Amino acid sequence: ESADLRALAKHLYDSYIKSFPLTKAKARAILTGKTTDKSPFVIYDMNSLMMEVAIRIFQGCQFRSVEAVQEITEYAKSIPGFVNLDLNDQVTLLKYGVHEIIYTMLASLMNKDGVLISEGQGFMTREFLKSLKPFGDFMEPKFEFAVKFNALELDDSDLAIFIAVIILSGDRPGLLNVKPIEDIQDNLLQALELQLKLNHPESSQLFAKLLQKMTDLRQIVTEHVQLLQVIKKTETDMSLHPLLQEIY
Amino acid sequence: ESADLRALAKHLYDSYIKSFPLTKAKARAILTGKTTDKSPFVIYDMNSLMMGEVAIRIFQGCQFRSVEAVQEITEYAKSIPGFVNLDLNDQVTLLKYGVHEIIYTMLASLMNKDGVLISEGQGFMTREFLKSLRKPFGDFMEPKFEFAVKFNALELDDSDLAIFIAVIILSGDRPGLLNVKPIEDIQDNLLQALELQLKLNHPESSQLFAKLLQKMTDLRQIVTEHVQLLQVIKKTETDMSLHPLLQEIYK
Numbered sequence A: 001e002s003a004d005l006r007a008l009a010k011h012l013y014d015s016y017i018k019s020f021p022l023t024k025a026k027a028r029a030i031l032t033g034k035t036t037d038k039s040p041f042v043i044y045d046m047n048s049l050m051m052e053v054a055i056r057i058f059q060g061c062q063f064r065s066v067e068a069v070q071e072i073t074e075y076a077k078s079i080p081g082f083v084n085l086d087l088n089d090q091v092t093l094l095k096y097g098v099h100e101i102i103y104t105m106l107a108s109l110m111n112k113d114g115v116l117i118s119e120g121q122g123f124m125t126r127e128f129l130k131s132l133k134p135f136g137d138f139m140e141p142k143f144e145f146a147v148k149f150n151a152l153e154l155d156d157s158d159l160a161i162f163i164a165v166i167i168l169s170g171d172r173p174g175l176l177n178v179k180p181i182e183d184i185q186d187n188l189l190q191a192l193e194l195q196l197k198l199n200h201p202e203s204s205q206l207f208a209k210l211l212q213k214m215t216d217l218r219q220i221v222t223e224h225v226q227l228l229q230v231i232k233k234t235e236t237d238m239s240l241h242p243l244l245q246e247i248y
Numbered sequence B: 001e002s003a004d005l006r007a008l009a010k011h012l013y014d015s016y017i018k019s020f021p022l023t024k025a026k027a028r029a030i031l032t033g034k035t036t037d038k039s040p041f042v043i044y045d046m047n048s049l050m051m052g053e054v055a056i057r058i059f060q061g062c063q064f065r066s067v068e069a070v071q072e073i074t075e076y077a078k079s080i081p082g083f084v085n086l087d088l089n090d091q092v093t094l095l096k097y098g099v100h101e102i103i104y105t106m107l108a109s110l111m112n113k114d115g116v117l118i119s120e121g122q123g124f125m126t127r128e129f130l131k132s133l134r135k136p137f138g139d140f141m142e143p144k145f146e147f148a149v150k151f152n153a154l155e156l157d158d159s160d161l162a163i164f165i166a167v168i169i170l171s172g173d174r175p176g177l178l179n180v181k182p183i184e185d186i187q188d189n190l191l192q193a194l195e196l197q198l199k200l201n202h203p204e205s206s207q208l209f210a211k212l213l214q215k216m217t218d219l220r221q222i223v224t225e226h227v228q229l230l231q232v233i234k235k236t237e238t239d240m241s242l243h244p245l246l247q248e249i250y251k
């Protein structure tokens, strides 16, 4: 029924809005399309940054991603059926799902020339990011993914359902009861297909093309974790990282 | 019109039968009870293999079959409407990156949880025998089996796979492509054809289209994994030759 499908899609949209402060609609109005309201502060070089450095930028993105994990966790609890799953499976779905969501939503904050930081009050250029040490290789593959992903011109109402599809994957390692997970995802996939067909009636096979993006997403995440343990061989020692590295 | 999509599906299935000598339909008839003029000889250990270095012999055997498969996939690709009209470097690029994703898709038709058909279905090599091979080589086929058991649960037949194999070839996110838009135009048409085919062939099968497309992630990971394993071999086995066609596909 278009009935419960449209009703599920509005439910998820409203919950997405409540859970994520910086929407895509708002990031775009700030980005290359600019409201004549308040320009963000631009970080293009060391002196504008001041106004290790590659390590504190790295650490700042960790702080932000820990915040996002909690925004995504509350969103997932609004997906019908998610909280009725086995508690271990809920934890497993979030553990393996959260990077994919982070890089998905980060694309909403990026264009080919940079990424919004600090709730949109800043803008760090793509060029300044490449100009770092081993840390110059972190954000480039996300910019390359973002550029191709944003070419799909999804909006928040589309991304709300797509994010739920990612969370309810079904193939995460260690799940205990796969069936209700794939049952929920089936119904989310149906809602996503109808949502794309009504929201983008002239965008042929957009559903299929969105699903193909999960390929690049999982490769991006796989690639991110390998660089993450490469720097466990640059930063290594001393103890005044107390509960800090515990929180991360 | 849906009528044009059915004709596209029929064309591709017809070329598939012509290009691939061992279909899933024949593989499943050999594997299951069915025909007993098709019963394979089973290789599960050294002496049954001796009756049909060992690890390397088996690996050169896989290499030859792989080269054979590239030739068959290449023949199939030329039948995909528009493929031969595209720029040449791109045809080559599409084949370079598509070939192994297709080989591991079609290899599932030859697999069950216990082993894999070989020598055009005359033989069956056990999954445990392949895993007991010396070190680097015991690890080649096991992720392939793991993929196949999940992929075979979709219950696709050759007419479904013909269209899916064409979707894979005509990607357009392949590294180094010159003109992406004519590629995506073909793939869009193929995706409509796949979508209609699954809805008609598997009517009671909810969201099979989405589930099948999601499987393109597992294929990408298997190739990536496989490429890492081959780097190990090139260093431990300096007296061993990869095939030129396979060398040029890998970079």
Ligand SMILES: CCCCCCCCOc1ccc(C(=O)N[C@H](C(=O)O)C(C)C)cc1
Binding pocket: B059, B061, B062, B063, B064, B065, B066, B067, B100, B103, B107, B116, B117, B118, B119, B120, B121, B226, B230, B246
């Ligand atoms: C069907 C007639 C010949 C039977 C041989 C069956 C052996 C299983 O089929 C395989 C097994 C492994 C591969 C494979 O991954 N080959 C690798 C590749 O081309 O990347 C390496 C040989 C390089 C390809 C085909």
